[PDB]
């Protein structure tokens, strides 16, 4: 049977699913690790024990325990990101979409969801891999990993909560793909991992971490890189936050054993209710439990790894969205509202800057403010709003990704860069937010090809182009068709630094994506904060 697959862990039974008036096979909820519950909480994952009989993989698995956004009850714009299944600590499963008839040895794409390392699900409607697997004829895999304290509580030095266990979950799912995808028609020597935001940062971390490098061939990073200021902390800050978490739950703090044991007795929701109270500063775009530079997963600091070429050398395709910051300002910066134009005063502007660069002394806050203010029109509410939007996006996403790409390209075997600047016509978020963080995802997964969702014809065409770029890159290491007549996505080189825009207009090639600001955020400010 096409729906029956015998893997090294046991037999699995999938289901047939309709897609664009056709069909493909789907294997949902395949377990790749033992349930991280009880004494296993905070612990590194262990391989799932083989099972007898047939595993029923016809329905989505549970979603990991996580914080749930309720800032806009009922609003589709934010609820489309919330868990759509029962949450449970028993959440390490993966999903596979296989073309029909089943391929013999085709390209594999493994999706790693984003969510700031504190949220995310592989089962969201925007992550349905059936469209992409069908249209491009690839085996699509989406995995899951523990988030928040459950996946990133770090008490370096103890084996009970080492940290980075969330990244080990991903690695474990990748190990399973490497060992079993051949039975689903996938070629294990041609797997591309791709993700967005925290997922993009995760992809970059597997490229850096020695233990993950041999598990995949190529990589795609969307709006996220390993060196982002929010993607990781030191072992000291990790330790400091773990202890403060324990203090909010009145736990014994005399020893690691004491704390860990007390945290393992708490119900999942009890840790989630106080998870945000451990941040060191009043801030925006900063999360509590994230990866930590431990000396194991990451041999040394990320900057030294990037300078010495200590990372997997292969081809990579990456880029960012035009307005990465508007989402974090809406939820946490004074002056912004979902139902108004959010024109910002001078007052709130400087207030926003303090919230965006929390680690900066007063001289630094002034450097930023000067770099983003137009003194010929300083009380222009619209310029201050967009100025704050640029700051958040440049500092948190764009400038960090440009640093990575320029460092990587010196040792890589091929780089392709994009700038997504098309605002979907059916967006429910206000206009001032622009090309929002995470909204390029729907084009990558082909949601525009389904009429009932209400996209324009040019948006459907844009989705096919992107799907074909991502898939062609996954297969060959070059998003361009060998002998095509279409416009060519030039290769990003240390010298020219070319990149393309991604929208419904005729392709246009550019150079040095936001260099002015990246030099400020990657060279000047760090130096200023270090000297003063």
Residues that bind a second copy (CB under 8 A): 363, 366-367, 370, 374-376, 511-512, 515-516, 519-520, 523-524, 527-528, 531-532
CB closer to a second copy, 221 vs 391: 391
Closer residue to a second copy, CB minimum distance, 254 or 516: 516
Min dist CB 242 to a second copy, Å, is 34
Is 457 or 531 the residue whose CB approaches a second copy more closely? 531
Burial of 120 (0-12, 13-18, 19+ CB in 10 A): buried
Q: Which is nearer to a second copy, 461 or 528 (CB)?
A: 528
* Cβ contacts of 154 within 8 Å, gap of 6 or more: 161, 162, 163, 164, 233, 235, 238, 239, 241, 242, 289, 292, 294
- Identity of the residue, 294 or 390, whose beta carbon is nearer to a second copy in the bound complex: 390
Distance CA 296, CA 164 (A): 10
Minimum distance of a second copy from residue 40's CB (angstroms): 50
Smallest distance, a second copy to C-beta of residue 107, A = 37
Let me know if 345 is a catalytic residue: no
Catalytic residue selected from 121, 197, 212, 342: 197
Whether the Cβ atoms of residue 166 and residue 195 lie closer than 8 Å to each other? no
Shortest distance (Å) from residue 227 CB to a second copy: 20
Contacts of 288 (CB under 8 A, 6+ apart): 118, 148, 149, 241, 245, 275, 276, 278, 279
Measured CA distances, 327 to 337, 359, 432, 433 (Å): 11, 21, 10, 7
Can you say whether residue 451 is alpha, beta or left, with left for phi > 0 and alpha for psi between -120 and 50 degrees? alpha
Closest CA to 314 of 214, 227, 222, 414: 414
356 is catalytic: no
Shortest distance (Å) from residue 421 CB to a second copy: 18
Residue 105 has a CB neighbour count (10 Å cut-off) of: 14
Residue tagged active-site, from 437, 440, 442, 463 = 437
Distance from the first to the final alpha carbon of the chain: 68
Catalytic annotation present for 437:
yes
Q: Which is the catalytic residue, given 324, 440, 459, 460?
A: 324
Let me know: does 63 contact 124? Beta carbons within 8 Å: no
Min CB(528)–a second copy separation in Å: 6
73 vs 375 by CB, closer to a second copy: 375
Active site residue ranges: 197, 324, 437
């Amino acid at each position: 049977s096409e729906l029956l697959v015998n893997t090294k862990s046991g037999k699995v039974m999938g289901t047939r699913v309709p897609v664009l008036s056709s069909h493909i096979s789907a294997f949902l909820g395949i377990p790749f690790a033992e349930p991280p519950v009880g004494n296993m909480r905070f612990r590194r994952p262990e391989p799932k024990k083989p099972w007898s009989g047939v595993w029923n993989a016809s329905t989505y698995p549970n979603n990991c325990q996580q914080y749930v956004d309720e800032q806009f009850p009922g609003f589709s714009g934010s609820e489309m990101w919330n868990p759509n299944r029962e949450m449970s600590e028993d959440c390490l499963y993966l999903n596979i979409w296989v073309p029909s008839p089943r391929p013999k040895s085709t390209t594999v794409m493994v999706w790693i969801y984003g969510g700031g390392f504190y949220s995310g699900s592989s089962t969201l409607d925007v992550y349905n891999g059936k469209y992409l697997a069908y249209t491009e004829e690839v085996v699509l895999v989406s995995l899951s990993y523990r988030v928040g304290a459950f996946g990133f509580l770090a008490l370096h030095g103890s084996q009970e909560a080492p940290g980075n266990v969330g990244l080990l979950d991903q690695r474990m799912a990748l190990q399973w793909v490497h060992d079993n995808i051949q039975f689903f028609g996938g070629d294990p020597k041609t797997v591309t991992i791709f993700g967005e935001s925290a997922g993009g940062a995760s992809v970059g971390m597997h490229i850096l971490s020695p233990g993950s490098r041999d598990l995949f061939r190529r990589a795609i990073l969307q709006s996220g890189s390993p060196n982002c200021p929010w993607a990781s902390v030191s072992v000291a800050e990790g330790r400091r936050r773990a202890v403060e978490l324990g203090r909010n739950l009145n736990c014994n703090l005399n020893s690691d054993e004491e704390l860990i044991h007390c945290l393992r007795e708490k119900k999942p929701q009890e840790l989630i209710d106080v998870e945000w109270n451990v941040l060191p500063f009043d801030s925006i775009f900063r999360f509590s439990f994230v990866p930590v530079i431990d000396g194991e997963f990451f041999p040394t600091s990320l900057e030294s790894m990037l300078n010495s070429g200590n990372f997997k050398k292969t081809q990579i395709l990456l880029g960012v969205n035009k307005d990465e910051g508007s989402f974090f300002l809406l939820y946490g910066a004074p002056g912004f509202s979902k139902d108004s134009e959010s024109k910002i005063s001078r007052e709130d502007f400087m207030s926003g800057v303090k919230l965006s660069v929390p680690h900066a002394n007063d001289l630094g806050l002034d450097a930023v403010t000067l770099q983003y203010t137009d003194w010929m029109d300083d009380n222009n509410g619209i310029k201050n709003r967009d100025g704050l939007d640029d700051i958040v996006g440049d500092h948190n996403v764009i400038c960090p990704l440009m640093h990575f790409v320029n460092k990587y390209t010196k040792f890589g075997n091929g780089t392709y860069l994009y700038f997504f600047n098309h605002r979907a016509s059916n967006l429910v978020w206000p206009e001032w937010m622009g090309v929002i963080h995470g909204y390029e995802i729907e084009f990558v997964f082909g949601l525009p090809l389904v009429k009932e969702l209400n996209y324009t014809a040019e948006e459907e065409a844009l989705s096919r182009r992107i799907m074909h770029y991502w898939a062609t890159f996954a297969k060959t290491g070059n998003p361009n068709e060998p002998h095509s007549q279409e416009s060519k996505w030039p290769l990003f080189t240390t010298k020219e630094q070319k990149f393309i825009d991604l929208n419904t207009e005729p392709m246009k090639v550019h150079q040095r994506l936001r260099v002015q600001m990246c030099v400020f955020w990657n060279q000047f400010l760090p130096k200023l904060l270090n000297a003063t």
